[PDB]
Symmetry: D2
Subunit: 384 residues, 4 copies
């Protein structure tokens, strides 16, 4: 019968299915296509959940999230980054994905023009499209560090209602430099445009990269989106938060109660223990493993002949220009899996226009995977 037109959005995951089949049929899978850590939640988080299963009913919490977790997040902004955030600014969400749903519904009406970098995270486009917004792609390249600029925003016509930035970004790993983000933030205020700052990969940054910064260092008019999924490796726990501007707090409160009732309560109780010294050590321990992995991957890539890369500043991705080896990146990735069993993500998923020249490689697994993958690509690539 009837299917809604707005429901007809592109899919997000499909590559992950393809990889899974290789293990079942061949068993030689090296996976560098994942958009998640290989590590799970830190042990203090797991311990808190284990205790809560005995001590807590796990009924509905208050819509905005438990006070303890809100207090802990607010205190983390001070203790680690020297910005004063009131607990009432923090709203707990069902992942950053849940946070984006709230942010887009509270900030934008149907037909509003919202801008974002390409390449970028595909789901922003797809959520905004389904919610009836007009998505304005800003093509970004090596010239501007794969990130938008204030000037680039200024040139856009007709005017925008919203801008979404991500630092560090999926799939590039590049961070917007503090000055540029501040400029972008300042521009938005002046232009009466709402800024959505994806800060999901904060905490996962590499040495010699530009420093990361919160949008609330410049402007509190911006909506900050963050998660427990990446830095704290609580990916399947579906927990994140928003820093909500005062004017939008009533709207966010009403929407969250109706749409979600509350975030996962076991995840909430457990996540308070993410802000312990032990959990932070385990999180930073994962980053240390990533840094080693990054070095091996970058150095390996040059040797095999892939030297044009987006600046790997953070996250756990290398965004690689593979154009010399192929006209179509989708075909390239499919073949490599079929031939070697090494699984990588095609750039088409992140960029419809220019992605066919590009590939995304994840280094959040074991070093063995990176090392073995490099051996296999090195033997395979010259005969392509």
């Amino acid at each position: 019968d009837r299917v809604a037109l707005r429901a007809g959005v592109p899919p997000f995951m499909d590559v992950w299915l393809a990889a899974a089949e290789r293990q079942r049929t061949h068993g030689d899978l090296v996976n560098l296509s994942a958009g998640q850590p290989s590590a799970g939640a830190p042990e203090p988080v797991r311990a808190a959940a284990a205790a809560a299963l005995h001590l807590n009913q796990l009924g509905y919490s208050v819509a905005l999230g438990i006070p303890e977790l809100r207090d802990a997040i607010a205190a983390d902004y001070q203790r680690r980054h020297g910005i004063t955030v009131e607990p009432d600014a923090v709203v707990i969400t069902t992942g950053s994905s849940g946070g984006f749903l709230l942010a887009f519904l509270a900030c934008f009406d149907a037909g509003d023009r919202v801008a974002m970098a390409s390449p970028g995270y595909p789901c922003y486009r797809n959520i905004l499209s389904a919610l009836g917004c007009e998505v304005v792609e800003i093509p970004c390249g090596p010239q501007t560090r794969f990130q938008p600029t204030a000037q680039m925003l200024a040139e856009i016509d007709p005017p925008l209602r919203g801008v979404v930035v991500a630092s560090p970004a999926n799939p590039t790993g590049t961070v917007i430099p503090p000055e540029e983000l501040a400029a972008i933030a300042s521009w938005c205020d002046a232009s009466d445009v709402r800024l959505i700052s994806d800060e999901v990969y904060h905490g996962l940054v590499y040495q010699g990269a530009p420093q990361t910064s919160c949008a609330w260092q410049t402007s509190r008019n911006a909506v900050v989106v963050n998660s427990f999924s990446k830095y704290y490796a609580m990916t399947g726990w579906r927990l994140g938060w928003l820093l909500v501007p005062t004017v939008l707090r009533r709207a966010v409160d009403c929407l969250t109660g109706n749409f979600t009732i509350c975030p996962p309560v076991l995840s909430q109780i457990a996540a308070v223990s993410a802000f312990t010294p032990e959990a932070t050590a385990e999180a930073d321990g994962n980053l240390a493993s990533y840094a080693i992995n990054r070095s091996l991957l970058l150095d390996g890539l040059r040797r095999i002949g892939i030297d044009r890369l987006a600046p790997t500043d953070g996250a756990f991705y290398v965004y690689a220009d593979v154009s010399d080896f192929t006209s179509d990146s989708l075909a390239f990735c499919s073949k490599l899996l079929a031939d070697t069993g090494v699984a990588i993500a095609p750039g088409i998923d992140f960029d419809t226009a220019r992605g066919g020249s590009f590939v995304r490689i994840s280094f959040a697994g074991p070093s063995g995977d990176i090392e073995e993958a490099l051996r296999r690509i090195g033997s395979w690539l010259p005969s392509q």
Copy 2:
């Protein structure tokens, strides 16, 4: 400073805040949730999974094991054959409604629902740009709509029905639901069947049925929140018609990525004999509570048929003011009908999912 117009929806919870402030001598009969937590096999499975599983993202539609278990439950308990592919795991029924409304309806579509009813259907649909058509229902009919009642509306794309319903507790009788289901097919209207309170039914009063007994064109919404008391675990499921499966798959991956994975792994153990015994044990406690409440109320006797864990009817004394005063005076907390019905709710909703002591002490 710009706030979206669509964001300006009514809130859901407000009574729960009022009760919290009192903690007088609080007796709470205003809750929309069980007082019990998850069954012990569910908790045990989660405890084990914290050691054995990474708890990364699952596949968007949910883990095969949980999908298989839900499909098998429809057969084993209710004699309807459901394919595992029909089942889509969601972040609660609230997450399920988001998917159902986005997949089935475009902005501007007319979707009908009973009043009184669950406030969040109106508020989700309004925010998603749909046109909400209230169907006022009272004692004269089921407090559930009928095909004829739907037929008389001019000019619908969708109908949402709930059996048993919040706040009445009434079930749509199997014949009437089938009729409603059949009408929808004939009229080319999409049916959203809220079946969240299935498994919580009382001796006699009507009987529950799945929409898929009559028509597979309807979307079935269900949850682990009420029968399995996994309220804070945020886990539910949809039975999705074949035509809508691609749309639901694409939306869920973009909007949620996947449902809570620890909740998914744990919920497989909900379909054990031990978990079912604990769930039915809760129902036995509710039945006792129901009897005490109904009999006590008469000693106010005009109520919606208590076929969930709610009693929905008083007018002689006043409803928003009534409830506020009773809490301030006695400390007994009850929900005002205004939250469920804007037109006629100024009615009361009393919850009996707590301990029997609370029920007994409550009357004054």
Copy 3:
């Protein structure tokens, strides 16, 4: 080709001790459920409840946060501190943390206490009826066990005077208050007298205080041996009051002179107590855990009242004072010459399972029966219905 004599296969003589027969009755009960399914069990020597939720939560967290390697032999400081503070907060006696030694149950505590205090051949006295395992441990460890027969006259508990009359002299005395199987508590004055006598007579006192916390209204008050004399060894457990029976955790209050001996023995014999049990048991001293423990006692009190009142009605009115624990020790002599036969028949006929007194008293136990009221009230009520119909036709 040729047959030949085989050398006698050697089993130690000291190993030839009686079994803990309370386990044997538990086996008999189990068969009734498998074959008939009508079992009402009043024969158990343990709570029907498990560990309190804060204890379980602490263990669940420790499985994630702690390696669970060997602890220090005497037990973790936190648990030792908590036990010492409990003596003050609840009973107003000052106990130094160093006095507390954590053990693998009270059973492990008795092994340490008996090895540290007594040599082989030493005369150690105990009440009969009593807990069978004291006799069996002491016998196996080469001590001479002196039974003191106790009855209604002396509240089924020894007295200082009774001890004074014993010849030849004793090296040790074991008292239990509340006791298995009677449930009687030694009154504070009498225990003090017993404690004082021991000091004067240079006799070591072993005070079993395992059932402390499980006492009923109008019973004599319970008291620690260390209120009178610190020369006595106090034995206690998490098994009964805190229902941590399978966790195998308890403690000793060790006199200063015996601390070196206990330390050396425990490290060699056990290395350390169960570490997960240790970490978890710190949370037993929370308000929530104490409420759950006292909640169990409230359920027992109700059960006690139903059982006592029911027993009089059916004609069993001569009982040991049910002061604590969760046992009624009943004189069934009017109904039977042999208690072992009585219990076997009742199980075969009604399915109600009770413990024969022979297990606790070899000499006089055949007149006696032990009934446990730590299960659900339904069990008590149904058991009373079944005995009432069965007994008059015996």
Copy 4:
């Protein structure tokens, strides 16, 4: 006179005493490298932990049957078949509160007070101390490089007056040496012929290194022997206090009666959890620990030669190197105390394991991280030449 029993006056388990000394160094100096531990640095495998976590929700955790839960008994019996090809009946298996609890049962069931029980020196100190406290006569058999630090049948044959019992450990604390299959069989056979009870400590089974003699169960030769084993070392369930005995048919009634009176039952949460030790995942994690030990062993042995300590007991299994330090010191106790005070490296003195000859010897543990081994080697290398 305030009375303490004479039998109570035994030596302490001095391994614990060294552990106390090490602890102080971390609190005061913070430079502790610990190679003195008698336990794995790893905890229980994740399937074991998961089973315990689930049991806390699903099980009352009351007393089990005295001999241990059927499931765990069945799993242990099946492990002897599946891994080592010996058929063991579930009734032969008795679950105990560690091997320490197992030794208490074994010694009480097999020996009366005054019975002569023999053991290798150096060896695990607790056998002597348990047997002494239980009133037995302990017969030390001094063992050295000549006989691989392990007793022989011939060595046993020479002992006068006759013995009632023999305790052997393979692999042993503190040497790490395994008794070769032939020699253990010979020892087992001798015992039967001589009407002497054999107690076979098999606690470190599963922790063996490449090119070492193979390990074997005493029940491959004789079922008259008592086998003692544990979850403490191979399965790293050290604080769970769980082990088992293979009990000869004649001793089963005695062991049953003693265990019920002395312990009631083993730790029930540990029992339920340990069933999951026999999963493929748990075995992989256990073997993973061994792989880490093997690396550590190689670094330690090679490092020791370079610094000048080259006379060692054959490191066949366990996680110990038993090192002859006589060239560097007359007293090993002083040596270890000084090294801790000077470098912060903590090692165990041989006196704890051998009262007569241990002052020439030292025990080094390699169950920690490789960093510890590597750093320890750097520190000893700088310190030793000026001694």
